[PDB]
């Protein structure tokens, strides 16, 4: 599920098309997971161990990031493709 099916669910999603005109495209390309981490109230990441998750009533979860290419066309016959890495 993690290695293949998630990436396929992302890849087969239709890209998002928006209008007012200014056309906007969104496409999701690549998928990333880190090891299960935890941010305290300071927002500081640290590796979370499963015993900590059992003890502190947390969820042994890993954050998920995606690379997103937004391609905006302002009906001037030009396409600006801006990429957000690891969203």
């Amino acid at each position: 599920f993690i290695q293949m099916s998630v990436q396929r669910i992302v890849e087969d999603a239709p890209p998002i098309d928006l209008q007012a005109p200014p056309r906007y495209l969104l496409k999701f390309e690549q998928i990333y997971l880190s090891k299960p981490t935890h941010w305290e109230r300071d927002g500081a990441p640290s590796p979370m161990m499963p015993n900590e998750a059992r003890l502190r009533n947390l969820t042994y979860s890993a954050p998920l990031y995606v690379d997103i290419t937004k391609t905006v066309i302002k009906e001037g016959e030009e396409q600006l493709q801006t990429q957000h890495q690891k969203t």
Binding site: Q3, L33, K35
Partner: peptide, 16 residues
């Protein structure tokens, strides 16, 4: 396939 990120590549954007 899904890439792995190390904990050092996690920017501190979750705090901001």
């Amino acid at each position: 396939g899904v890439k792995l990120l190390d904990i050092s590549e996690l920017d501190m954007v979750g705090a901001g």
